[PDB]
Ligand binder design. Structure first.
Ligand SMILES: CC1=C(/C=C/C(C)=C/C=C/C(C)=C/CO)C(C)(C)CCC1
Length: 175
């Protein structure tokens, strides 16, 4: 029944980059394979005068060898035929942090309260995603109204990611 083909997924209608700017607290995440941000994750989005979107982000990550560090990350986004779908180039302030180029899709947002983000890093032969990640972001660090929670849950189901997220703490560690 459920179509899990990435090419089928709905994204945010008439996505507005400028209204999306500012501070976004990560409340929940679905992990990909390998090294990934762990917790204390906060993003800052910006858009310049020509419509070019970029972001910084902080979060705790534990390395190779179990070393715990505060990652300071940077991303730059390229626009596509769909206003809600981007290519994100990313790197760290420290040279040893992971660098890459990921799809970056805004699945849904009301710009003032929540956002659901998605990235498929690898397609299966059948069109479904072999390696994804997803953030649930909030403007306000706290639990979301029950009304907003219901909508977020539905979006998770539509991405074929329901029941695959974990809650993320904030306790300072990265200042
Ligand atoms: C840049 C960037 C993002 C992704 C960051 C990633 C993927 C970080 C991974 C870091 C690693 C693996 C560090 C250890 O080397 C998100 C989607 C939050 C949006 C804001 C900008």
């Amino acid at each position: 029944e459920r179509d899990c083909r990435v090419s089928s997924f709905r994204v945010k209608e008439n996505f507005d980059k400028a209204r999306f700017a500012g501070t976004w607290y990560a409340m929940a995440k679905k992990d990909p394979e390998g090294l990934f941000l762990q917790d204390n994750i906060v993003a800052e989005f910006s858009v310049d005068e020509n419509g070019h979107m970029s972001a910084t982000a902080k979060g705790r990550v534990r390395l190779l060898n179990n070393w715990d560090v505060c990652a300071d990350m940077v991303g730059t986004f390229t626009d596509t035929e769909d206003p809600a779908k981007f290519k994100m180039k990313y790197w760290g302030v420290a040279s040893f942090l992971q660098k890459g180029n990921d799809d970056h899709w805004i699945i849904d947002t009301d710009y003032e309260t929540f956002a659901v983000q998605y990235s498929c890093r690898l397609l299966n032969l059948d069109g479904t995603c072999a390696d994804s990640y997803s953030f649930v972001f909030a403007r306000d660090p706290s639990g979301f109204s029950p009304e907003v929670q219901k909508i977020v849950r539905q979006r998770q189901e539509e991405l074929c990611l329901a029941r695959q997220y974990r809650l993320i703490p904030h306790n300072g560690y990265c200042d």
